[PDB]
Every structure is written in C-alpha cells, then in structure tokens.
Amino acid sequence: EVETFAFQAEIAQLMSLIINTFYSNKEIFLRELISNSSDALDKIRYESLTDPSKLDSGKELHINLIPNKQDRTLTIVDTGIGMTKADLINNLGTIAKSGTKAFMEALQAGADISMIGQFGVGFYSAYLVAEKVTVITKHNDDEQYAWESSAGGSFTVRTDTGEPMGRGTKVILHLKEDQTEYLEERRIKEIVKKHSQFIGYPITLFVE
C-alpha cells in the first residue's frame, strides 16, 4: 500500500529553489549525503555504548558509493541508525521548515547553496543532480521503508519488500540526463577527495 503525502509548503519551495536556481557547483550534493551518513553512523555507534543490542542488526559501520550506468543511479549506502516511518512522514519535515527558512534568509543575504548543510537541510541538495530520489531505510525497531519523491510537491512512503538491509539507509539518486558525470569513477573520486576527505568511516566506491 503506497501512501502519497504532500510536502509542507516550505519544503516544496525549498525543493523548487534547488531545482530552479542557476547554480553550477552541483557536486556539493555528495558531501552533504556522505556527511548525513557519517552522522547516522556516529549516532548508532554512540547509542550502542549504552545499549549494545542496537548493533545486533549489523556491527559494520561504513559507507558504499554505488554507481550504475544501466539504471543511471548513484546510491549512497550506510549502515547508520536509519529512519523511522514517523521520521519520513512528519518529523524530518517539521524540523526542516526552520532550516529552510534560515537557509533562504542566508541566501538573500548573499550566502550560496553550498552552505545548505549549515541549515540542516543538505539532503535536499540531492535534487541538484537527481530527477527522482528513492530513500530505502531500516531503523532497529521498525520496518524497512521506501520513501520516494520527484519533487512536484508530493512524496510516497511504502513498506519495502526489495532486498532487506539489516540497518541503515540507501539514498538512490536517479540522476538527471545531463548529470551522468557523477557516475564516473574519476569524478566521484575527485569530489570525495575535495569535500569528504576526513570522514571517519570507510567509503567504498564500487566499480562497474
């Protein structure tokens, strides 16, 4: 049963801003997604100190970057804390309202889109390069969910029946036709080295 939801208006306008503004420095999306993965890994690691069972769903803490030219996808996989249904449907959006407002204010004052992460809404920079984003996620005491949006003001959430994950998040970037440079090993390596070089977890770049 696929449920369809309307974004809060502020979030829909955030996504419209990212899709519509002329801004050539699109590669920062990867730093923002890798940074979110790293934070999610930090979180499960720390919580596991006071509740070691929380690693029963997988001890390994890492990030994979998986390009697939057949599907025109780039997937950022982590074994972090994952997200709950309540996260996906309501709670992330409620928080990102304030971040969106602060971000838009900073931009009018002369900030640029590369600073989006300072406002807690860097995930949406995925829409610099992706026409559609699918987020597969599994949090410990909850089911595996698939969230999906091509913007346009709505998103869907369904229980995922594809490959079970254990714990963590996959962000599947369905890249725009003119953004397939982010499927090339040389380009991804350049970007990781430039903007994600001190991440404290292994980042494996799959080959094709």
Side-chain angles (χ1 to χ4, degrees), residues 4 23 26-27 35 46 54 122 127 148 166 187 190 192 204:
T4 305
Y23 179 74
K26 295 178 172 291
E27 74 183 52
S35 182
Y46 203 84
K54 292 185 171 194
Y127 289 89
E148 197 166 72
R187 180 67 166 125
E190 181 187 39
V192 171
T204 302

Side-chain angles (χ1 to χ4, degrees), residues 144-160:
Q144 189 167 303
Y145 297 99
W147 177 106
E148 197 166 72
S149 188
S150 300
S154 62
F155 67 92
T156 65
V157 179
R158 69 198 71 177
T159 303
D160 187 43

Side-chain angles (χ1 to χ4, degrees), residues 51 53-54 57 81 84 138-142 145 167:
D51 184 1
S53 70
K54 292 185 171 194
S57 45
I81 188 88
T84 65
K138 175 71 178 85
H139 191 289
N140 269 331
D141 299 294
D142 208 344
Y145 297 99
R167 187 202 55 253

Side-chain angles (χ1 to χ4, degrees), residues 14-58 60-69 71-100 102-107 109-125:
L14 172 63
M15 302 172 69
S16 285
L17 185 169
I18 291 167
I19 293 154
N20 296 328
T21 299
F22 181 76
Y23 179 74
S24 295
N25 185 37
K26 295 178 172 291
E27 74 183 52
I28 60 90
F29 80 89
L30 191 62
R31 168 192 65 206
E32 300 303 329
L33 298 179
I34 287 172
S35 182
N36 288 343
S37 294
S38 181
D39 292 346
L41 292 158
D42 287 351
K43 171 165 202 108
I44 183 67
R45 182 175 67 192
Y46 203 84
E47 291 191 358
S48 76
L49 295 179
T50 55
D51 184 1
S53 70
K54 292 185 171 194
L55 268 46
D56 293 337
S57 45
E60 208 207 338
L61 300 185
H62 70 138
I63 301 177
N64 297 333
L65 303 177
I66 306 177
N68 182 315
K69 275 150 188 277
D71 304 342
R72 216 204 285 148
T73 60
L74 176 59
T75 300
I76 300 81
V77 188
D78 69 69
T79 50
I81 188 88
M83 282 170 286
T84 65
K85 198 175 188 196
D87 284 334
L88 296 170
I89 292 173
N90 199 61
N91 288 339
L92 297 166
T94 71
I95 300 299
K97 276 176 64 176
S98 64
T100 299
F103 180 47
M104 289 169 79
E105 287 165 352
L107 286 175
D112 76 294
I113 283 167
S114 66
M115 292 151 138
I116 185 169
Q118 290 188 255
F119 306 91
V121 295
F123 165 79
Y124 298 96
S125 72

